[PDB]
Amino acid sequence: STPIQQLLEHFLRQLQRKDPHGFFAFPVTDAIAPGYSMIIKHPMDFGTMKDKIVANEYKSVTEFKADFKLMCDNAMTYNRPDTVYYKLAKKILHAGFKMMSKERLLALKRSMS
Ligand SMILES: COc1cc(-c2cc(C)c(=O)n(C)c2)cc(OC)c1CN1CC(O)C1
């Protein structure tokens, strides 16, 4: 395992503990959500992101943040605002971007000197 992999696994774990029922743990299927694929063209989930970290598919924290935003955006695009999925996606989005903020990544960048 590499330093970037270790850092991405930490961010992922801290994000995964916000989803207790595992609604974002594995991909959304047409069986679980009717006509999902007709609406969501670029699907994403925590499990897909885990495989990518392991496969060393992330060159930056930005690439990781982009797949995380994608996951939350898809849940807010498919589901209406009064649903449990939309509300959880909104909360985990705000949580991930506070945790992976410019101020936090800057403090980290400066600690690598
Ligand atoms: C992958 O797992 C599920 C994902 C969803 C889900 C549905 C929509 C529409 C949606 O946008 N997102 C993001 C997730 C719903 C599920 O069923 C209640 C499950 C089943 N699992 C949950 C565990 O408790 C059983």
Best of 15, 21, 23 for a ligand 1 pocket test (most atoms within 8 Å of beta carbon): 23
C-alpha 56, offset from chain centre = 16
Class of residue 67 by CB neighbours under 10 A (exposed 0-12, middle 13-18, buried 19+): middle
Write the CA distances from 51 to 13, 56, 77, 102, integer angstroms. Answer: 13, 9, 24, 25
∠ Cα 69 39 82 (to 5°) = 65
Tokens, residue 94 = 């705000």
d(CA 38, CA 77): 12
Return the ligand 1 atom nearest residue 33 CA.
9
- What is the span of the domain harbouring residue 57? 1-113
Query: Based on the structure, what is the number of domains in the chain?
Result: 1
Residue nearest ligand 1's atom 18 by CA: 23
Contact 45, 67 (CB under 8 A): no
Return the CATH number at 89.
1.20.920.10
For this experimental structure, what is the resolution in angstroms? 2.3
| Elucidated via | X-ray
- The count of residues in the chain is 113
Q: Is 86 in the pocket of ligand 1 (CB under 6 A)?
A: no
Report the candidate in 28, 100, 34, 39 with the shortest Cα–Cα distance to residue 71.
Answer: 28
The protein residue with its alpha carbon nearest to ligand 1, atom 19, reads 23
51/95 Cα distance (integer angstroms):
22
